[PDB]
Design an enzyme around this catalytic site. Structure first.
Site, PDB file in Angstrom:
ATOM      1  N   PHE A 209       8.139 -11.830  37.269  1.00  0.00           N
ATOM      2  CA  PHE A 209       7.851 -11.743  35.840  1.00  0.00           C
ATOM      3  C   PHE A 209       7.193 -13.067  35.359  1.00  0.00           C
ATOM      4  O   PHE A 209       7.632 -14.157  35.762  1.00  0.00           O
ATOM      5  CB  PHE A 209       9.131 -11.563  35.059  1.00  0.00           C
ATOM      6  CG  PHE A 209       8.891 -11.053  33.666  1.00  0.00           C
ATOM      7  CD1 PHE A 209       8.481  -9.735  33.446  1.00  0.00           C
ATOM      8  CD2 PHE A 209       9.094 -11.868  32.593  1.00  0.00           C
ATOM      9  CE1 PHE A 209       8.249  -9.274  32.193  1.00  0.00           C
ATOM     10  CE2 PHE A 209       8.888 -11.390  31.282  1.00  0.00           C
ATOM     11  CZ  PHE A 209       8.444 -10.108  31.084  1.00  0.00           C
ATOM     12  N   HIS A 212       6.889 -16.830  29.783  1.00  0.00           N
ATOM     13  CA  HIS A 212       7.119 -16.358  28.452  1.00  0.00           C
ATOM     14  C   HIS A 212       8.103 -17.288  27.742  1.00  0.00           C
ATOM     15  O   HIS A 212       8.764 -18.069  28.384  1.00  0.00           O
ATOM     16  CB  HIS A 212       7.678 -14.933  28.469  1.00  0.00           C
ATOM     17  CG  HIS A 212       8.992 -14.814  29.155  1.00  0.00           C
ATOM     18  ND1 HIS A 212       9.135 -14.846  30.520  1.00  0.00           N
ATOM     19  CD2 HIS A 212      10.245 -14.736  28.643  1.00  0.00           C
ATOM     20  CE1 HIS A 212      10.433 -14.802  30.830  1.00  0.00           C
ATOM     21  NE2 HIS A 212      11.114 -14.704  29.705  1.00  0.00           N
ATOM     22  N   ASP A 214      11.379 -16.659  25.117  1.00  0.00           N
ATOM     23  CA  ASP A 214      12.227 -15.506  24.812  1.00  0.00           C
ATOM     24  C   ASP A 214      12.118 -15.110  23.303  1.00  0.00           C
ATOM     25  O   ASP A 214      11.960 -16.000  22.456  1.00  0.00           O
ATOM     26  CB  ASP A 214      13.694 -15.799  25.060  1.00  0.00           C
ATOM     27  CG  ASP A 214      14.042 -15.780  26.549  1.00  0.00           C
ATOM     28  OD1 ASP A 214      13.202 -15.315  27.386  1.00  0.00           O
ATOM     29  OD2 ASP A 214      15.194 -16.135  26.887  1.00  0.00           O
ATOM     30  N   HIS A 268       9.471 -20.080  30.574  1.00  0.00           N
ATOM     31  CA  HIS A 268      10.088 -19.879  31.893  1.00  0.00           C
ATOM     32  C   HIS A 268       9.527 -18.620  32.522  1.00  0.00           C
ATOM     33  O   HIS A 268       8.882 -17.813  31.844  1.00  0.00           O
ATOM     34  CB  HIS A 268      11.620 -19.856  31.807  1.00  0.00           C
ATOM     35  CG  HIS A 268      12.153 -18.822  30.834  1.00  0.00           C
ATOM     36  ND1 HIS A 268      12.108 -19.012  29.457  1.00  0.00           N
ATOM     37  CD2 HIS A 268      12.701 -17.585  31.029  1.00  0.00           C
ATOM     38  CE1 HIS A 268      12.594 -17.933  28.855  1.00  0.00           C
ATOM     39  NE2 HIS A 268      13.020 -17.087  29.779  1.00  0.00           N
TER      40      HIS A 268
END
Ligand SMILES: CC(C)[C@@H](OC(=O)[C@@H](NC(=O)CCC[C@H](N)C(=O)O)[C@H](C)S)C(=O)O
Ligand SMILES: [Fe+2]
Length: 329
Positions: A209, A212, A214, A268
């Protein structure tokens, strides 16, 4: 050449208590972490995380395809138009590895006022058949309130960390209306592992993933013992080491907004690792109409020019942006 992030272990037990100076000592450690890489491990948290992972694993391993279609969000099942957030997020064999089950506030029932008003972001949870998964719904609802309690405590810490009275955040985080979610994620072992399910970062790292920030106030995460997360710093990404006894905490972009970026929402990403593992985030969201007035801890007068943002609007925008930027999970 990949370094390791400083992720301090902070004993949060005083935040459940009445020793105010001990609470301040916790708050100091939270401030320090929040101004460094932005992650810490909450330890001495009082949640039975062995039972969380056991029960989570029994679910993921025993649910059948028929049940997954029955529980599917609308991305996977056109018949479920009201399921945008809550439900099953299917894997796609040969293409997509991860699968997950998301649920919201157990108080969102057909007869809750926000559901009766059809307010966006509020949905009634969907659950598997009790006979096929005995005790699962009981487990998952109790877990929601357990991590709710921990989160409330953590938010008292963040409030004192920023110089506010301890209810500054927590007073907007209520069982009756919280938009908080739990996601029970399974990352499988697969051999061969589907190439479509592995992304290559600009820096060459293989990811499950992408990077981004959060969409949350804070994120309160339990993961099993397989190292996978990385946090971005100015000198590039750093490994976050795993700890399947603690909760990993970080701020989300609503905290960054309201603090004039004094507490950043750390960027992260998730490395690709071929190993069976679990990732069980709780996204600490406030109520739809919650608004905190932004402030700037760096300024003697505390003033910020930033607009107050309503949490429900923030959440709607954020979840859509996540999907558009990083894909349908
Ligand atoms: C350890 C992390 C990075 C985790 O990733 C997430 O859970 C992702 N979150 C979402 O997809 C938002 C889910 C929201 C939920 N469906 C809801 O409606 O509240 C994010 C990019 S943090 C992981 O993949 O282990
Ligand atoms: Fe995240």
């Amino acid at each position: 050449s990949v370094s390791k992030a400083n992720v301090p272990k902070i004993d949060v037990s005083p935040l459940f208590g009445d020793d105010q100076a001990a609470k301040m000592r916790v708050a100091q450690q939270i401030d320090a972490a929040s101004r460094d890489t932005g992650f810490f491990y909450a330890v001495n948290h009082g949640i039975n995380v062995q039972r969380l992972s056991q029960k989570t694993k029994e679910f993921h391993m025993s649910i059948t395809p028929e049940e997954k279609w029955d529980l599917a969000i609308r991305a996977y099942n056109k018949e479920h138009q009201d399921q945008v957030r809550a439900g099953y997020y299917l894997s796609i064999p040969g293409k997509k590895a991860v699968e997950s089950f998301c649920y919201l506030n157990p108080n969102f029932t057909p007869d809750h006022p926000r559901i009766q008003a059809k307010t966006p972001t509020h949905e009634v949870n969907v659950w598997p058949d009790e006979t096929k998964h005995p005790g699962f719904q009981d487990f998952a609802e109790q877990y929601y309130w357990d991590v709710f309690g921990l989160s409330s405590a953590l938010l008292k810490g963040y409030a004192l960390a920023l110089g506010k009275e301890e209810n500054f955040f927590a007073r907007h985080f209520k069982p009756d209306d919280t938009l908080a979610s739990v996601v029970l994620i399974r990352y499988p072992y697969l051999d061969p592992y589907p190439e479509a399910a592995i992304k290559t970062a600009a820096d060459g790292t293989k990811l499950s993933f992408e990077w981004h920030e959060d969409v949350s106030l804070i994120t309160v995460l339990y993961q099993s013992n397989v190292q996978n997360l990385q946090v971005e710093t100015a000198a590039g990404y750093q490994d976050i080491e795993a700890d399947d006894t603690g909760y990993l905490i970080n701020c989300g972009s609503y905290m960054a907004h309201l603090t004039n970026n004094y507490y950043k929402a750390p960027i992260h990403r998730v490395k690709w690792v071929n190993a069976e593992r679990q990732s069980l985030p709780f996204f600490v969201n406030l109520g739809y109409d919650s608004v905190i007035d932004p402030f700037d801890p760096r300024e003697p007068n505390g003033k910020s020019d930033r607009e107050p943002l309503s949490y429900g609007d923030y959440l709607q925008n954020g979840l859509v942006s996540l999907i558009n930027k990083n894909g349908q999970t």
